[PDB]
Design an enzyme around this catalytic site. Structure first.
Site, short mmCIF file in Angstrom:
data_model
loop_
_atom_site.label_atom_id
_atom_site.label_comp_id
_atom_site.label_asym_id
_atom_site.label_seq_id
_atom_site.Cartn_x
_atom_site.Cartn_y
_atom_site.Cartn_z
N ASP A 123 0.85 -1.20 0.00
CA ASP A 123 0.00 0.00 0.00
C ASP A 123 0.88 1.24 0.00
OD1 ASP A 123 -2.22 1.63 0.15
OD2 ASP A 123 -2.69 1.22 2.23
N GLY A 145 -8.69 9.38 7.19
CA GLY A 145 -8.12 10.74 7.11
C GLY A 145 -6.63 10.84 7.41
N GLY A 175 -1.97 7.39 4.48
CA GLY A 175 -1.03 8.04 3.54
C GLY A 175 0.08 8.76 4.30
#
Ligand SMILES: [Ca+2]
Length: 223
Positions: free
Chosen positions: A84, A175, A178
């Site tokens: 990922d 949120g 990343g």
């Protein structure tokens, strides 16, 4: 981030907000032209916002730069979330200064127990939601292999680490995906997945950055 604290302003100068109309995922600046994030954050138009602290107000240190190229790892797997990771090239170079700065890639993988810092503008509530304006921070340890695999039987691959607390109440959430896990000056995780946020016995799982340094360098060199 659940159970965190408000970061001091501009004290995490490698943190980026990915925006399309509004904030949707974090990322980390690893050189003046390139941000690393999570592949499951992919959208085809992304604005990168650097130097942020309050996402709701223009404060005057910000640089807003649109993504020119978005490259997701070729073996990213949507069930298992293995690999990922995604790289974004900016359409012009970030200007580096005290509010905007790169984080080093890992020199090796991290020992169990290593304390790290996790940051982002994700949800702050287990119960209900509440997306913060101000960047939130969380110190948490790299968990052993055992503790991570026993939480998620059959689901943890060799490209994943668990970081956090088995008692619950402290973790990353929607949120924050990343965004950076930095330990001793080095980026060792990307916020990836979990069962819920801050649940007892289900710590966050993070992409294990120390496996990807060759792919990151080769992709930067070719693009
Ligand atoms: Ca701002």
């Amino acid at each position: 981030i659940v159970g965190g604290y408000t970061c001091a302003a501009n004290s995490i100068p490698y943190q980026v907000s990915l925006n399309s109309g509004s904030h949707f995922c974090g990322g980390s600046l690893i050189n003046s032209q390139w941000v690393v994030s999570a592949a499951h954050c992919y959208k085809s138009r992304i604005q990168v916002r650097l130097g942020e602290h309050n996402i709701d107000v223009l404060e005057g240190n910000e640089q807003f730069i649109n993504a020119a190229k978005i490259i997701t790892h070729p073996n990213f797997n949507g069930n298992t979330l293995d690999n990922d990771i995604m790289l974004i090239k900016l359409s012009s170079p970030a200007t580096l200064n005290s509010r905007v700065a790169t984080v080093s890639l890992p020199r090796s993988c991290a020992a169990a127990g290593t304390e790290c810092l996790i940051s982002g503008w994700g949800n702050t509530k287990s119960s209900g939601s509440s997306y913060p304006s101000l960047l939130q921070c969380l110190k948490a340890p790299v968990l052993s292999n055992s503790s991570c695999k026993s939480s998620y039987p059959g689901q943890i691959t060799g490209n994943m680490i668990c970081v956090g607390f088995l008692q619950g109440g402290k973790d990353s959430c929607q949120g924050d995906s990343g965004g950076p896990v930095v330990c001793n000056g080095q980026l060792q995780g990307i916020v990836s997945w979990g069962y819920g946020c801050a649940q007892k016995n289900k710590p966050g799982v993070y992409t294990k950055v120390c496996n990807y340094v060759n792919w990151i360098q080769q992709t930067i060199a070719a693009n």
